[PDB]
Design a protein around this ligand. Structure first.
Ligand SMILES: OCCN(CCO)CCO
Ligand SMILES: [Ca+2]
Length: 230
């Protein structure tokens, strides 16, 4: 009994469900861009079957690849949104841990609050990590470094009014590798009545976290076998 799920079944080369996902048509605009955030260096997003498609073997493929002078990739945001008191999990394979790449699985909200379940940074500086943000600019957060490899893994979070918890490859009764108490973040928005969040799966190229892709190996793929919330 899932409140939201996508098993990404369907024929090779087809698009993910338009009923479940919004596919980004552009990379967000960066207000005061660092070098790799500059228009013309930042990677782009588009709804193109070369960059986001089902492999016909039960996986969503998000692919970053150079087209002309621009790196293109993809971002999906769930149309559905879910509130407190659920468990959220995706099975993911990062075939894209290369210079310039910046994959992420996260729960978003356009007002405040963000649960970055896992991000890996290709810029050669930032360690991969799980992060909880509160506050409008996300300027109040707790973060936890965790290593990412290219194997299949399940990334899980639970959150409610009292806190947020994270697991890697969850097994029965395992302790979260990271948890955050509401009381540890003064502006904790997750306890607001009716507060909900959408799911995001994306593979960015360049920008701050991605950095220089010139030495990286492209095409680079992020595979998603499923996303489930219950
Ligand atoms: O975190 C980034 C790692 N990345 C940066 C290289 O300069 C190398 C990946 O193989
Ligand atoms: Ca699947």
């Amino acid at each position: 009994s899932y409140v939201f799920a996508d098993e990404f079944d369907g024929p090779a080369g087809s698009a993910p469900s338009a009923a479940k996902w919004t596919i980004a048509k552009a990379r967000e605009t960066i207000q005061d861009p660092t070098y790799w955030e500059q228009p013309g260096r930042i990677g782009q997003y588009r709804n193109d079957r070369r960059n986001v498609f089902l492999d016909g073997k039960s996986n969503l493929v998000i692919r970053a690849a150079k087209d002309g002078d621009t790196y293109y990739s993809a971002k999906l945001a769930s149309v559905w949104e879910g509130g407190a008191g659920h468990t959220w999990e995706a099975r993911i394979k990062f075939n894209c841990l290369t210079a310039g790449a910046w994959p992420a699985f996260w729960l978003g909200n356009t007002g405040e609050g963000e649960l970055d379940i896992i991000e890996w940074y290709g810029n050669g500086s930032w360690p991969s990590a799980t992060t909880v943000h509160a506050k409008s600019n996300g300027g109040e957060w707790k973060t936890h470094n965790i290593a990412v490899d290219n194997g299949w893994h399940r990334w899980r979070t639970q959150w409610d009014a009292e806190g947020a918890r994270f697991w890697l490859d969850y097994t029965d009764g395992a302790q979260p590798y990271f948890e955050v108490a509401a009381s540890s973040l003064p502006d904790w928005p997750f306890d607001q009545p009716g507060y909900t969040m959408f799911v995001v799966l994306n593979l960015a190229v360049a920008g701050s976290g991605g950095g220089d892709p010139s030495g990286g190996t492209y095409p680079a793929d992020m595979l998603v076998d499923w996303v489930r919330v219950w």
